[PDB]
C-alpha cells in the first residue's frame, strides 16, 4: 500500500490563472525496469475520469498542451498553464508501479470568488411528520464562500450529535457559492421533551457563530 498524498485538497483558481497540484508517494515510484508509473486524471462532474498525463510527463492523445506533469521518484507536480472552465473538476494522481495500485484523494479545482456569509434558515417539524411519530428540524445554510463550514445543533443549550445528517452542494453554476442542509432527526416524543432548538454555524466570514433557533412551545 503506497500512500499517495495530494496537496492542496482544494484549489480555488481564477479562470486564466496558473495552477499547480502536488502528489507525493510513500516510497519511490521508479519501477525495476526503470520506468516511473505516475499518472494524472481529470474527473469532471457526472463524468468518468480522463487520462491527462501518463508516466509523469507524457501527455495523452488530445490532452491540451496547457497541461504538463513533472517530478521524479516520490515527488510530482501537475501544472495547468491557463485554467479554462472545461478544466474544473477533481484531479487524481495514480501509481501503478507497486501492487496494489493506488490513487491520491483528489484535488477539486474550483472557482475563486469573494467570501460570502451564509443565509441561514431554521425550520420546525412539520405537523405532517409529527402525526407519524417523528420530528425533523432542518437548517439551510445557503450561498456561502468558501465551502468550509461546520454546523452545531444544540437542544436546550447542550450540543447534540445523535440524529444529525449533513448535505453539501457543489459549487454553484452562476455565483460560485456553496450551500448546505442540516437535519436533526428526533422522535416526536423527544422533541416534545425539549423546547429550545438551535443550529449554529461557523464560517470564515465572522468569528462569532451564526445562531438560528426557535422554541417549540411557541410554534
Amino acid at each position: 500500500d503506497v500512500v499517495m498524498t495530494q496537496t492542496p485538497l482544494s484549489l480555488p483558481v481564477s479562470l486564466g490563472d496558473q495552477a499547480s497540484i502536488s502528489c507525493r508517494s510513500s516510497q519511490s515510484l521508479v519501477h525495476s525496469n526503470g520506468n516511473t508509473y505516475l499518472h494524472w486524471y481529470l474527473q469532471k462532474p457526472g463524468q468518468s475520469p480522463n487520462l491527462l498525463i501518463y508516466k509523469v510527463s507524457n501527455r495523452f492523445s488530445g490532452v491540451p498542451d496547457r497541461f504538463s506533469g513533472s517530478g521524479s521518484g516520490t515527488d510530482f507536480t501537475l501544472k495547468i498553464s491557463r485554467v479554462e472552465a472545461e478544466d474544473l473538476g477533481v484531479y487524481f494522481c495514480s501509481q501503478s508501479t507497486h501492487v496494489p495500485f493506488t490513487f491520491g484523494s483528489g484535488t477539486k479545482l474550483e472557482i475563486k470568488r469573494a467570501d460570502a456569509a451564509p443565509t441561514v434558515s431554521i425550520f420546525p417539524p412539520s405537523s405532517e411528520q409529527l402525526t407519524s411519530g417523528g420530528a425533523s428540524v432542518v437548517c439551510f445554510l445557503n450561498n456561502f464562500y468558501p465551502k468550509d463550514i461546520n454546523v452545531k445543533w444544540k437542544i436546550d443549550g447542550s450540543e447534540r450529535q445523535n440524529g444529525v445528517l449533513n448535505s453539501w452542494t457543489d459549487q454553484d453554476s452562476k455565483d460560485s457559492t456553496y450551500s448546505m442542509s442540516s437535519t436533526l432527526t428526533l422522535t416526536k416524543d423527544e422533541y416534545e421533551r425539549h423546547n429550545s432548538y438551535t443550529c449554529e454555524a461557523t464560517h470564515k466570514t465572522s468569528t462569532s457563530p451564526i445562531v438560528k433557533s426557535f422554541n417549540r412551545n411557541e410554534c
Binding site: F60, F101, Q129, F140, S167, W168, T183
Partner: protein, 209 residues
C-alpha cells in the same frame, strides 16, 4: 476504440454478481486490464488486474476484494469479467474497467453501477419546510425522506438548491430549498412537486405559513 462495462444492478448483501467488459476494434489482445471502482461521493479505488496471455494471465487484487473477487477474461470473446461474490454494502460503487493501448490507465468507459443493499423499494415521506414561530426574501423547502431506490425529483412551482441525497440506515433522504421575494409568499401559492418513479409516487406539497 473503447470499453463497455455491463452486469451491474441491485443485489443483496452476501449476494454474487458477474461484471463484463468488452474492448472495441483496433487489432490487439495483448494487453493488461483493470477494474477500478468509485463509491458514491468518494475517490477512485483500484480493485483488480489481469495480464494478457503472454504474461500467463497473472492476477493481482486490492486487499478489500481478496478471496471475494475474481478478475478473469476470455480473449476469443474479447472480454474481461469480474466475478464478485460474498458482496457487501461497501462494495456499492460504479465499476470501471481501465486499460491502455500503450498509455497506462488511458481508456475508461462510462461504467456499470453495482448497488449492494437489502432495502425494498420505499415511497418517500414529503414534508414542507416553512417558517416560523420578517425580511425581503423568504426561504422555503421540502424534506424528502426515507426513499429507495434513488431518483427523486423536486420541482418547485432559478434560486433553487437541490441537496444531493445521503444514505440513512438503508434509505435515502434529500431536501430542496427555494427562495422567493416576501411579496410573493404567503400571499400566493408555492408548492414542491416530488416524483419518485420507482414507487409510482408524486406528491404535490403546498407550503402554508
Amino acid at each position: 476504440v473503447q470499453v463497455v462495462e455491463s452486469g451491474g444492478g441491485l443485489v443483496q448483501p452476501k449476494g454474487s454478481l458477474k461484471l463484463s467488459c468488452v474492448v472495441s476494434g483496433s487489432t490487439l489482445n495483448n494487453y493488461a486490464m483493470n477494474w477500478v471502482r468509485q463509491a458514491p461521493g468518494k475517490g477512485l479505488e483500484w480493485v483488480a488486474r489481469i495480464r494478457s496471455k503472454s504474461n500467463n494471465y497473472a492476477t493481482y487484487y486490492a486487499d478489500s476484494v481478496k478471496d471475494r473477487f475474481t478478475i478473469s477474461r476470455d480473449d476469443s470473446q474479447s472480454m474481461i469479467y469480474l466475478q464478485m461474490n460474498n458482496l457487501k454494502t461497501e462494495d456499492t460503487a460504479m465499476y470501471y474497467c481501465v486499460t491502455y493501448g500503450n498509455h497506462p490507465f488511458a481508456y475508461w468507459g462510462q461504467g456499470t453501477l453495482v448497488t449492494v443493499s437489502a432495502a425494498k423499494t420505499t415511497p418517500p415521506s414529503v414534508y414542507p419546510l416553512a417558517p416560523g414561530c420578517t425580511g425581503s426574501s423568504v426561504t422555503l423547502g421540502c424534506l424528502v425522506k426515507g426513499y429507495f431506490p434513488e431518483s427523486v425529483t423536486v420541482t418547485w412551482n432559478s434560486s433553487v438548491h437541490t441537496f444531493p441525497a445521503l444514505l440513512q440506515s438503508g434509505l435515502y433522504t434529500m431536501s430542496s430549498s427555494v427562495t422567493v421575494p416576501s411579496s410573493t409568499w404567503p400571499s400566493q401559492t408555492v408548492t414542491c412537486s416530488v416524483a419518485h418513479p420507482a414507487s409510482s409516487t408524486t406528491v404535490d406539497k403546498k407550503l402554508e405559513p
